[PDB]
Subunit: 396 residues, 2 copies
């Protein structure tokens, strides 16, 4: 398979959308899919073709000056950049099986090219005018055109799908949820003092053992499994120097915790943004993920990227997200006893647990965006299998 990704207004080669595009493309290429990322040329020294990795290139198209053309003026270069892409493809004798365009400017480019090339257009908006003037009204119109014309609308979340339905009357049948990987730059162990800093912020002594839960507080994410497992641990041996932190949004669990006499061992933390969530993962010795359903396992990968080993239920994408015996453990089912057993084993074996947290970082870096790319590759194959483009239907 040969994929043309389009990122007109921003190069994936500078240090959210940039890392999404680079990471997914890098991971697709690892799988043997050829990806060319097309971007406007901005850096004379890069040349036209940047060979990034096996199967992965960035193509720099001249359309307007290298500098001095702002994002707001980039619509003027829509046709020129499209023509520049086409001219490249002719000089180079390259053909593609599918286009994945990113942000509305690239969608507009990709829409023209999908008709010409007679191949599917996958489109990811990243941000939307209706979720955020004559400028913004013009952008919204273009985003609506992509809603009404692209073959697949790829969104990051269920919320994004809902924003497309509400604001753009998008057909839910054309929407596919493709979950991004863990932000491995944000979620990192930090320096030698970083875990100390996190503990201090949260008011937790350095010597205490900490188990954390992160996620929406609803029964299919199993926070009740953790709570009941903690009660069982304390029933077995009340002397644990153990605290639990649960973060933390409603879809009750404290009522549950006090019923079981563990409400002074489990603190509920309010949901917080990613930059604040790093401290939770860092302060934790173990992250427990007792999901009944888990497509994906983003929390598990955020925890591992942060250097914290994971005890996960053996469900969904969790056996992939956690390297069993290397970066954490997998639990069969959801009994409080089996969860207490796994927790005790990692809590009492410091040497193994610490090594697992250290190994978790490189595991996340190699494997978090890899599951996003498997989703994309699956979605691409389906779009191609079901491809009918005659270039005649154009809802302008």
């Amino acid at each position: 398979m040969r994929v043309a990704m389009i990122s007109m207004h921003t190069s994936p080669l500078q240090q959210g959308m940039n890392v999404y595009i680079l990471s997914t493309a890098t991971e697709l290429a690892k799988q043997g899919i050829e990806v060319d990322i097309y971007t406007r040329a901005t850096r004379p020294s890069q040349g036209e073709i940047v060979r990034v990795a096996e199967n992965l290139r960035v193509i720099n198209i001249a359309a307007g000056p290298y500098e001095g053309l702002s994002k707001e003026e980039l619509p003027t270069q829509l046709a020129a950049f499209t023509g520049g892409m086409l001219s490249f493809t002719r000089r180079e004798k390259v053909t593609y099986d599918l286009i994945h365009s990113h942000y509305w400017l690239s969608g507009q480019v990709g829409w023209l090219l999908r008709d010409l090339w007679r191949i599917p257009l996958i489109h990811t908006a990243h941000t939307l005018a209706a979720v955020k003037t004559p400028e913004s009204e013009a952008r919204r119109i273009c985003e609506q055109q992509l809603v009404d014309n692209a073959d697949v609308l790829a969104v990051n979340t269920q919320e994004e799908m809902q924003d497309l339905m509400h604001h753009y009357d998008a057909d839910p049948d054309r929407i596919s949820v493709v979950s991004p990987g863990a932000d491995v730059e944000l979620y990192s162990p930090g320096n030698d003092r970083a875990t100390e800093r996190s503990r201090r912020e949260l008011g937790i002594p350095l010597h205490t053992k900490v188990v954390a839960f992160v996620g929406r507080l609803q029964p299919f994410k199993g926070p009740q499994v953790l709570i009941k497992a903690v009660a069982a641990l304390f029933d077995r041996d009340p002397d644990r120097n153990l605290r639990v932190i649960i973060c933390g949004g409603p879809s009750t669990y404290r009522h549950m915790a006090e019923e079981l006499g563990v409400e002074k061992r489990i603190r509920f933390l309010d949901p917080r943004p990613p930059s604040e969530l790093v401290a939770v993962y860092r302060a934790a010795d173990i992250v427990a993920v007792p999901s009944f359903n888990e497509s994906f396992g983003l929390v598990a990968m955020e925890a591992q990227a942060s250097g914290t080993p994971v005890i996960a239920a053996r469900v969904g994408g969790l056996p992939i997200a956690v390297a069993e015996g290397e970066t954490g453990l997998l639990v069969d089912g959801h009994s409080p006893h089996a969860w207490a057993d796994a927790l005790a084993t990692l809590l009492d074996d410091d040497e193994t647990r610490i090594r697992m947290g250290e190994d978790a970082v490189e595991h996340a870096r190699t494997f978090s965006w890899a599951a996003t790319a498997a989703q994309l590759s699956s979605l691409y194959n389906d779009a191609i299998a079901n491809e009918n483009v005659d270039g005649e239907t154009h809802h302008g």
Copy 2:
């Protein structure tokens, strides 16, 4: 010869009532020659539908790209790819193949540039206005537009301009290669230049029973204003008491007042400062005859403006003038440039009120039918040369 042209006019429809007139007038005249022209524009009026049949060989294609109203010219760049894609979709549904593209104004040129590469056919581009000429040492968006106009200067196969001044403007501001520039002269503005004359003679202080001869043009020898002056001296030699006054308008390359003084006719000849087209209507209207004693005259625009105004023309039998003037119907044609031939021709029309007035009336339809005809004739030549010398690889793209 079998020929089909796509004209591109994204931001403005030929079907409403500047560029509009040029596009519709050139397309219409080209269609009369048996060239099939489709003018592509953004859809703005549901009632028109997709395809408008204007005349035999002439269609307007309305392409949906954004809302039919509420999208200003300034936000139109956001629809560049959508409109190009929409054009392409129409061509696939309709199964129509083109031989040449003629784009108008930078937005359409950008569309035409992509397509000319895809189809490997020439792009002829008319700017009509330019950011660098309008503005001067501007905003982020005037700058973006200028860059796009510069791309078209550096990529289009032919740059068609209205005048020599526009050619110079392209050379100065955009470093345009003069070998890629062709001057294509627009036809006479037959709305502005129309008969409506008493009011004109009051405006110009011409009283009022008198017979008047006007000259309009650059006051340089290849336009022959000296020929008229010497012809007028000869007339007054024949009849010291003749009917006649002369108005010369105007603009240096005062040779000619001193010349009129030398020949003893300075009182019967008046020199008017050049003026805008608005003001120039009055001079054509005040005149009974317009004299065009050119030695060189590619086009005959003054002749056509005079005719449109309902004033018959006496012209030298040179260049584009025997086409511009219907000889013996809307004026006279003079062989050579002797004062005596010119005095003969003047006297023939001054002394025959009935034929002169009839010629003036016939002149109006002649202009309204024939002025953009010469424009479309040079376009057809230009289009043929562009196709004969076509060299579009689809690969060279100076973005």
